[PDB]
Design brief:
Blueprint (H helix, E strand, L loop, with lengths): L2 H11 L36 H5 L6 H9 L1 H4 L13 H14 L3
Helix pairs in contact: 1-5, 3-5
Bound molecules: heme C.
């Protein structure tokens, strides 16, 4: 749960299409503020695939751990183009960082 290595993974691997700050803007991928604790496909103003919208699960560490590994497998037909973070640590790191930054 190194929030400090998580941030690197985020910038190196998510920042292209995503913003985590409040008031932050939708890029290719939506803004992730208020992520934790909300259903999938909830960011306002963004245009979700119907999959991402109907997944209907709640984001929190458990569902993230699972999604980051093969997003396409977690939400088949998701417009997000991203293979997944294979190693568990990275995924905990990156989850540590999002729990933090999408809530601050
Ligand atoms: C651009 C090519 C992306 C990269 C790199 C990452 N994500 Fe993304 N993300 C992208 C899109 C276009 C979408 C919506 C896709 C759809 O089918 O609707 C998403 C969605 C997410 C979500 C969904 C959450 C929700 O509100 O439903 C999450 C939690 C998410 N993305 C996180 C995430 C992380 C942590 C990434 C880095 C490893 C990452 N994404 C990469 C576009 C792109």
């Amino acid at each position: 749960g190194d929030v400090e290595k998580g941030k690197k993974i985020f910038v190196q691997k998510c920042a292209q299409c995503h913003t985590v700050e409040k008031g932050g803007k939708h890029k290719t991928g939506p803004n992730l503020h208020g992520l934790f604790g909300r259903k999938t496909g909830q960011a306002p103003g963004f245009t979700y695939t119907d999959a991402n919208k109907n997944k209907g699960i709640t984001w929190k560490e458990e569902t993230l751990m699972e999604y980051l590994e093969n997003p396409k497998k977690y939400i088949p037909g998701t417009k997000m183009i991203f293979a997944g973070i294979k190693k568990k640590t990275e995924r905990e790191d990156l989850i540590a960082y999002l729990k933090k930054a999408t809530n601050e």
